[PDB]
C-alpha cells in the first residue's frame, strides 16, 4: 500500500487530455455559478443559519401578509411579495440569494412573476432551474450528488460524478467516461469506489465498510 | 472514530431476530453446498491449479478423443466422455468436482446425458444450476457476488448481498432488508458502504476511495 501514491500518479499519467469527452475551466464555472447556488444544503430550510422560530415567523407573515435583525433581508423580500412591490434583478444580485425556508428568493419571486424568469435565472439554485440539455455544464452540475459538488467546489484534483471521472489539470477539469477510468485504474494496479463525506472504511465487517456519521 | 466498535454493537442490538425476513443455519448451508460449488473462481479455467498447457492438452483430447499426473482424474473424466462409458453419481461424489477448464464434471456430463441431470445437481456449481425460485436459499446464493460468497464461507458476523443484510447470531444468518439496515445504521450514528476484497479506502482523492489491487 506504500506504492499507492505512485500508482495514482501513474494512473493520471495514462490519460490523454486531448481526447477528453469534454472540459470545463474552473474559472468559467465560478464565474457562472455562485457556490450558494450549487450546494444541496441551500435547497433545505436554513436551520443552521436561523433559529427555527424565525423561519416559522416568516412563513406566518408570507401566508398572512400583515421580527429580529437576523432576518432583515428576508423580511424585505416577504413584504415585497405581500405588497406586490417589484424587485429588480439588481436586488437579487445584491442579496444573500438563499431564502430561510430553502431555495432562492429569485425562484420564489419568479413563480409569482413568470415574465421575469429569464432575467432571474442567474440567481436561482441549479436544482431550481429547468432540466438542462444533455451534455451541457448545467446538466452535469444538476446530476451531481453532494460529495461531487463539494469536490468540485474544493477544486479537488479528481472526483467522480455519474460514471464520469473529472480530472483536474491546471485550472481545467477534463471528463473521461467510466470505461476509460476503469481501464486506466486496471493498468495502474488500482481499485476504486465512491464514498461519501469522509467515510474511510475505518472498520470492516464481512464486506461492509463502516464509519461514524 | 473510537466509538465505532460500540456503535456497531448498538447497531446489532437494534435488530429483532424474530422478525427477520428469513434465516438460514450455516450448518444446513455447509451440508447442502460444498464451498467449491459456491466460489466464483470454480467457474473459471483452473489456471492457478494447473499449467495452462495441461488444460489445453485436455481440450485437445476431448475434441479429438484419441498426460501428466496432475491431471489423472480429469483424464479419467475425458476418456469416459469420449468412450461413452458411464459415470455414476458416486463417481462425482468421490471426485474433486471442478473440471480444469472451469465449471464442474457433473454439469458437462449431464449436458451429454440429460436424463442423469437431477441426480447430478448436488455436484454442480450454483451458477450451473437452473435459476432458483425467488426467495429460496439457492436464489440468494446465485445472486451473491464474490465478496458476499467469501464472507458467507468465512462465517462472517455480517455481510451485505443485494440490499439484504445478513446478520449472524450463533450459527444462524438472519436476513434483513435494506430499509431496516439503513434505519438501524442511522440510529447508531453509522454510515456504511460495500467494498470489495480488502479495499479499505487507504487513500482518498476528492470523493474517490483508492486502494491497491
Residues 139-158 of B with CB under 8 A from A: 147-148, 150-151, 154, 156-158
Cβ–Cβ < 8 Å for A132, A138: yes
Q: Which residues, numbered 80 to 99 in chain B, qualify as contacts with chain A under a Cβ-Cβ cut-off of 8 Å?
A: none
Cβ under 8 Å to A: B residues 152-211: 154, 156-160, 166, 185-186, 189-211
User: Resolution of the deposited coordinates, in angstroms?
Assistant: 2.0
Of B158, B208, B212, the CB nearest to A194: B208
Give the residue from A187, A166, A162 showing the smallest Cα distance to A176.
A166
Cα B73 to Cα B77: distance, rounded to the nearest angstrom: 6
Q: Do A206 and B3 touch (CB under 8 A)?
A: no
The phi, psi pair for A84, rounded to 5°, reads 75, 15
3-class DSSP state of B20: coil
* Distance from the B179 Cα atom to the nearest Cα atom in chain A, whole angstroms: 16
Query: Which residues does residue B212 pair with via DSSP β-bridges, in sequence order?
Result: A190
Q: Which residues on adjacent β-strands are paired with residue A25?
A: A172
B185 close to B192: Cβ distance less than 8 angstroms? yes
Contact status, residue A97 vs residue A116, Cβ threshold 8 Å: no
Q: Which residues of chain A make contact with B196, given a CB cutoff of 8 A?
A: 191, 193, 207
Q: Beta strands A172-177 and A22-25: pairing type? A: antiparallel
Backbone breaks in chain B (C–N > 2.5 Å) follow which residues?
Answer: 66
- Are A213 and B191 in contact (CB < 8 Å)? yes
- Interface mutation vs chain A, best among B149, B185, B207, most A CBs within 10 Å: B207
Q: Which residues have a C–N gap over 2.5 Å right after them in chain A?
A: 66
Q: Phi then psi for A69, rounded to 5 degrees? A: -85, 10
The three cell numbers locating residue B206: 476528492
Q: Looking at B84-197, list the stretches that DSSP marks H as alpha helix, in order from N- to C-terminal side.
A: 89-94, 105-112, 117-120, 137-142, 146-153, 178-188
Task: Take residue B30 and report the three cell numbers written for it.
Answer: 455447509
Structural contact between residues B37 and B153, judged by C-beta atoms closer than 8 angstroms: no
Query: Strand order of the sheet with strand B203-205?
Result: A190-194, B208-212, B203-205
Report the distance separating Cα B57 and Cα A6, nearest Å.
41
CA dist B62 and B12 (Å) reads 53
What is the DSSP code string of A64-130?
H----TTSHHHHHHHHHHHHT----HHHHHHS--B-TTSSBHHHHHHHH-GGGHHHHGGGS-TTTSP
Spatial distance between the Cα atoms of A209 and B159, rounded to a whole number of angstroms: 10
Say if strands B164-169 and A208-212 run parallel, antiparallel, or are unpaired. unpaired
* Cβ neighbours around B14 below 10 Å, total: 12
Distance from B174 to chain A by nearest Cα, in Å? Answer: 15
For the CA atoms of B28, B29, B31, B34, the dihedral, rounded to the nearest 10 degrees, stands at: 180
Cβ of residue B26 closer than 8 Å to a chain A Cβ: no
Elucidated via = X-ray
Q: Which residue in the set A190, A207, A211 is minimally distant from B212, CB to CB?
A: A190
Q: Put residue B194 in one of left, alpha, beta given phi > 0 → left and psi -120 to 50 → alpha.
A: beta
Q: Read out DSSP for A10-21?
A: HHHHT--GGG-S
- Helix-helix angle A52-64:A72-83, to 10 degrees: 10
Amino acid at each position: 500500500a506504500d506504492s499507492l501514491p505512485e500508482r495514482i500518479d501513474l494512473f493520471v499519467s495514462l490519460f490523454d487530455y486531448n481526447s477528453a469527452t469534454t472540459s470545463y475551466d474552473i474559472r468559467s464555472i465560478q464565474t457562472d455559478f455562485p457556490t450558494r447556488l450549487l450546494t444541496p444544503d441551500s435547497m433545505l430550510p436554513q436551520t443552521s443559519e436561523y433559529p427555527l422560530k424565525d423561519i416559522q415567523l416568516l412563513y406566518k407573515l408570507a401566508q398572512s401578509c400583515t421580527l429580529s435583525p437576523l432576518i432583515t433581508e428576508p423580511l424585505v423580500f416577504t413584504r415585497s411579495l405581500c405588497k406586490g412591490s417589484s424587485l429588480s434583478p439588481r436586488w437579487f444580485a445584491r442579496s444573500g440569494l438563499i431564502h430561510p425556508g430553502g431555495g432562492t428568493y429569485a425562484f420564489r419571486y419568479a413563480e409569482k412573476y413568470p415574465a421575469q424568469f429569464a432575467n432571474l435565472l442567474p440567481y436561482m439554485h441549479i436544482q431550481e432551474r429547468p432540466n438542462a440539455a444533455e451534455g451541457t455544464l448545467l446538466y452535469h452540475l444538476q446530476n451531481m450528488g453532494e460529495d461531487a459538488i463539494n469536490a468540485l467546489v474544493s477544486g479537488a484534483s479528481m472526483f467522480g460524478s455519474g460514471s464520469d471521472l473529472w480530472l483536474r489539470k491546471g485550472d481545467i477539469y477534463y471528463l473521461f467516461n467510466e470505461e476509460t477510468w476503469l481501464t486506466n485504474a486496471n493498468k495502474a494496479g488500482l481499485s476504486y469506489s465512491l464514498l461519501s463525506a469522509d467515510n474511510t472504511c475505518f472498520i470492516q465487517r464481512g464486506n461492509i465498510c463502516w464509519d461514524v456519521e
